[PDB]
């Protein structure tokens, strides 16, 4: 071996570049996502406004279908390509199969594309890791994650990007089975996760939800402001 | 070939005791005009098998070329192994079938005669790939005319001698000279035994016309 190229095993049995293309994901912006029982929720941090532009084009949360939602980390160009191919693939699934697209299908497609992309000669691995949240079969909320290796892996909540161990540790130290959702608890759980963000500046918070029958709703950072205020009120009630 | 330009005519072949005799004539008629009245329509393959054909003569030249090259190749292998005549028959059948599958048939009618390892062989190959074995073969109008003489004597006597076989071939070719319009009084007889392959010269027929003095 060496860190060159993607095809050689290590002398102790690793692929260097799979572990190494995860590092670019590990060094990206944070985005979390949970499932409530009826409403699914996710959101990104780090709006990072540079005082002189628009930001409606830099949106890290998009959709492929009327049922499914996106997120990513890592570098954004691979996200743009994968999202472009995912739209085409989701529509081609809609072409033959007349269903609303199951989330498991589009995650298998993304991971399969990612792995057959990684196997080949000198194609640079996609340095992203997506979050694919949706609720199709009887409105059952699901969220899967990806990896530069190409392993779709179903969870109930998630944290990626920079310092994701602390954020997932907050979902570990919070995550109550009770009750239920209760969309209010899911909203407050998003509020606690975004308060538990790596920075939590209060204005760099961007969150979007889906109530498993509607479409994506982009919020307004005053409802979130009153959410942060009542989180601070409950924190005062702790004293 | 869709339209046969220069056709041959009927080929006769019959086994006998330890050998096969084949005789075909030497005419290259185009339409009704007998344009090529001295040509050879039998290839003497290496030492055992032997080929005679009908239909388009150019295709016969082509198969002569290809078979000659294959026989030369196996003899240049130097292994002491040859093609059995039945293998040649199989190869030619597969060749014609793969030819006609592409809707470009070889307009031919081929007869393969061989003697190897004590046993005689006499095979047939059609244009359509229809292929079988027989104690006596007859192509073109020979299957209409000289076939019942062969099947008469073979029913009355299943085996033959070389002299009787050659005489019967002479009589059948006499009859074919009598009433085939595409026929000619010049033919060559080719014979295989264990002693090798032999091509006899351009023989002829002895005819009768004593019915013409009647009205």
């Amino acid at each position: 071996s060496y860190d060159r190229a993607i095809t050689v095993f290590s002398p102790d049995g690793h692929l260097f570049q799979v572990e190494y293309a995860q590092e670019a994901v590990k060094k990206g912006s944070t985005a979390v996502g949970v499932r409530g029982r009826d409403i699914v929720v996710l959101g990104v941090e780090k709006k990072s406004v540079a005082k002189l532009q628009d930001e409606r084009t830099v949106r890290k949360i998009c959709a492929l279908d009327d049922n499914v939602c996106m997120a990513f980390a890592g570098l954004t160009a691979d996200a743009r390509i994968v999202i472009n191919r995912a739209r085409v693939e989701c529509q081609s699934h809609r072409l033959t199969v007349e269903d609303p697209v199951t989330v498991e299908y589009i995650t298998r497609y993304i991971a399969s594309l990612k792995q057959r992309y990684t196997q080949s000669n000198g194609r640079r691995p996609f340095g992203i890791s997506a979050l694919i949240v949706g609720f199709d079969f009887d409105g059952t909320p699901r969220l899967y994650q990806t990896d530069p290796s190409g392993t779709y892996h179903a969870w109930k909540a998630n944290a990626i990007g920079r310092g994701a161990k602390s954020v997932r540790e907050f979902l570990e130290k919070n995550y109550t089975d009770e009750a239920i959702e209760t969309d209010d608890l899911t909203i407050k759980l998003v509020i606690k996760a975004l308060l538990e963000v790596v920075q939590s500046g209060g204005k760099n918070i961007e969150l979007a939800v889906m109530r498993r029958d509607q479409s994506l709703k982009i919020l307004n950072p005053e409802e979130i402001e009153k959410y942060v205020a009542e989180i601070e009120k409950e924190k005062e009630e702790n004293e | 070939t869709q339209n046969p330009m220069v056709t041959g005519t009927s080929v006769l072949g019959v086994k006998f005791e330890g050998g096969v005799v084949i005789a075909a004539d030497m005419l290259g008629s185009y339409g009704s005009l007998a344009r090529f009245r001295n040509i050879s329509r039998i290839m003497r393959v290496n030492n055992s098998t032997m080929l005679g054909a009908s239909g388009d003569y150019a295709d016969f030249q082509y198969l002569k070329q290809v078979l000659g090259q294959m026989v030369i190749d196996e003899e240049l292998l130097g292994d002491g192994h040859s093609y059995s005549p039945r293998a040649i028959h199989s190869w030619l059948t597969r060749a014609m079938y793969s030819r006609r599958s592409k809707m470009n048939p070889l307009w031919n009618t081929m007869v393969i005669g061989g003697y190897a390892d004590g046993e005689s062989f006499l095979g047939y190959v059609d244009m359509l790939g229809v292929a079988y074995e027989a104690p006596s073969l007859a192509t073109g109008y020979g299957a209409y005319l000289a076939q019942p003489l062969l099947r008469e004597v073979l029913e009355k006597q299943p085996v033959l001698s070389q002299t009787e076989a050659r005489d019967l071939v002479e009589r059948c070719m006499r009859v074919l000279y009598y009433r085939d319009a595409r026929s000619y009084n010049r033919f060559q007889i080719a014979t295989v035994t264990e002693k090798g392959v032999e091509i006899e010269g351009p023989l002829s027929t002895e005819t009768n016309w004593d019915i013409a003095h009647m009205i």
């Binding site: 033959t96 199969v97 269903d99 199951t102 498991e104 299908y105 | -």
Partner: protein, 201 residues
């Protein structure tokens, strides 16, 4: 050749004859026309033997692959759609195929109708074959939604009897399959002459 299909309160009824001629000559009397695709799908044979048999076997292949990849059994409309899309790629090259697709769904009953001309349509009653018009007649006499089970059995059986009685290209054993909520169940295989003695009076 005469097939029909109709769904009702208690599932779907499918019946067919078993005569398959060759020109003016009858080849067989026991051609099982309703091709058993799955333990939850039933396909038929409606115009042409080889085309219907081959393409439905390939559809069964595709359905088993779909279930083993998604861990969830395919719907009916998806299967009919896959069959129509696969048949459509040889349009004009001379495929004759007029089968029907039946099965149970998450939505419940499912009944589609796929041609080699690609007329993929849903519906409630269908009938295919040379003597299909006779079946349409007697079926649209006896059709309702609130029928019983043995009533629907008698309706379909009487229907195939009338169809084979008038048409010349039909006869043989009367198959009769019944699709339930869990899976399909063969009801009976009745000969024509037994029905003639029983229903002639």
């Amino acid at each position: 050749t005469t097939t029909l299909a109709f769904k009702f309160r208690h599932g779907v009824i499918v019946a067919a004859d078993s005569r398959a001629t060759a020109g003016a000559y009858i080849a067989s009397q026991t051609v099982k026309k309703v091709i058993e695709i799955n333990p939850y799908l039933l396909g038929t044979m409606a115009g042409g033997a080889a085309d219907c048999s081959f393409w439905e076997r390939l559809l069964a292949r595709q359905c088993r692959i779909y279930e083993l990849r998604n861990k969830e059994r395919i719907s009916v409309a998806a299967a009919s759609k896959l069959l129509a899309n696969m048949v459509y790629q040889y349009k004009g090259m001379g495929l004759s195929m007029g089968t029907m697709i039946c099965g149970w769904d998450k939505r419940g009953p499912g009944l589609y109708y796929v041609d080699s001309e690609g007329n993929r349509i849903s519906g409630a009653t269908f009938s295919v074959g040379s003597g299909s018009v006779y079946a349409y007649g007697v079926m649209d006499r006896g059709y309702s939604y609130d029928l019983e089970v043995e009533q629907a059995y008698d309706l379909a059986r009487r229907a195939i009897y009338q169809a084979t009685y008038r048409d010349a290209y039909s006869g043989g054993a009367v198959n009769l399959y019944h699709v339930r909520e869990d899976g399909w169940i063969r009801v009976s295989s009745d000969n024509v002459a037994d029905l003639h003695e029983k229903y002639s009076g």
